[PDB]
Design an enzyme around this catalytic site. Structure first.
Site, PDB file in Angstrom:
ATOM      1  N   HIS A 209     -37.010-100.995 -78.764  1.00 27.87           N
ATOM      2  CA  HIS A 209     -36.185-101.884 -77.954  1.00 27.87           C
ATOM      3  C   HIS A 209     -36.319-101.572 -76.489  1.00 27.87           C
ATOM      4  CE1 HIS A 209     -33.800 -98.259 -77.456  1.00 27.87           C
ATOM      5  NE2 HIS A 209     -33.211 -98.871 -76.446  1.00 27.87           N
ATOM      6  N   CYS A 210     -35.762-102.449 -75.658  1.00 30.37           N
ATOM      7  CA  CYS A 210     -35.699-102.165 -74.235  1.00 30.37           C
ATOM      8  C   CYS A 210     -34.300-102.596 -73.805  1.00 30.37           C
ATOM      9  CB  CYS A 210     -36.814-102.829 -73.421  1.00 30.37           C
ATOM     10  SG  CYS A 210     -36.849-104.601 -73.336  1.00 30.37           S
ATOM     11  N   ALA A 211     -33.996-102.436 -72.528  1.00 32.78           N
ATOM     12  CA  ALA A 211     -32.660-102.706 -72.018  1.00 32.78           C
ATOM     13  C   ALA A 211     -32.160-104.142 -71.904  1.00 32.78           C
ATOM     14  CB  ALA A 211     -32.499-102.000 -70.666  1.00 32.78           C
TER      15      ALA A 211
ATOM     16  N   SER B 107     -37.739 -98.751 -72.305  1.00 33.93           N
ATOM     17  CA  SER B 107     -37.210 -98.790 -70.942  1.00 33.93           C
ATOM     18  C   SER B 107     -36.199 -97.656 -70.771  1.00 33.93           C
ATOM     19  CB  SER B 107     -36.549-100.149 -70.638  1.00 33.93           C
ATOM     20  OG  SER B 107     -35.493-100.441 -71.531  1.00 33.93           O
TER      21      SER B 107
END
EC number: 3.1.3.16
Lengths: 150, 150
Positions: free
Chosen positions: B91-93, B35
């Site tokens: 990962h993402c936010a 993201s």
């Protein structure tokens, strides 16, 4: 965020514990805070939401014997889940360390599960594809790869 | 926070992506941000840490077709894991929606796994008892309950 890891039993985070609208939407009736800050009292929104609270004080340290709370926490979860309509959220302040431990103990103490079986039950129910579109997209990739051409 | 869900492959959160000391301690060599915010560039600490970055722009909406990134993301993870010493953080936010989807796609595309098998692999490796003391305490409860008296 919260996962229903056992019927009526949600393992969630501090943000979910702080979200009045979502707690209402889910119909949560009980909240077990596995890391209650002693200087605080019952979370402000719970009385209105009709939520019964249990706050156990525990530090996420190998030096803290969480065993001291196994029975009280399990008894509370049992009381919540024994009544139809009962829905409980178990959480702690940072991750799932203190909360997951109390949930596993409850499953072991009230549903005759070994620790391995309890861990499997919880892990199998912590979702990793909340986005229905992403799920559809992955299932499409899956069909393509499993079947091939034609 | 991060879980090694496949050898050398860590599924983690934004805080871990922002933690220079921990990324160093773990020996992370690649970071896939599922993201990436278009107005940002490569995270400030990565160049010094020797971390190779891939930022894919995606919204966690059923209307966003994550499929557009399956190949590029899988190819990146493959490049990272193909070299001995390679350790990647995905990962993402906010949670694990966008990141988990890319990890599952990678497992399906490079390790011949069905979506169900990939989901099991990931879920089985997202730990819920990080506290070694709590683990010891639960194992003690387990022996007591499984064996009984004597």
């Amino acid at each position: 965020h919260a996962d229903e890891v056992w019927p009526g039993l949600y393992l969630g985070d501090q943000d979910m514990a702080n979200n009045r609208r979502e707690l209402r939407r889910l119909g949560i009736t009980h909240v077990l805070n596995a890391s209650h800050s002693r200087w605080r009292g019952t979370p402000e929104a719970y009385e209105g939401l009709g939520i019964r609270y249990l706050g156990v004080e525990a530090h996420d340290s190998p030096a803290f014997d969480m065993s001291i709370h196994f029975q009280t926490a399990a008894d509370f979860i049992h009381r919540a889940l024994s009544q139809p309509g009962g829905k409980i959220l178990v959480h702690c302040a940072v991750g799932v360390s203190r909360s997951a431990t109390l949930v596993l103990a409850y499953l072991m103490l009230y549903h005759h599960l070994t620790l391995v079986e309890a861990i499997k039950k919880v892990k199998d129910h912590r979702g990793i594809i909340p986005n229905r579109g992403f799920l559809r997209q992955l299932l499409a990739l899956d069909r393509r790869l499993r079947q091939g051409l034609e």
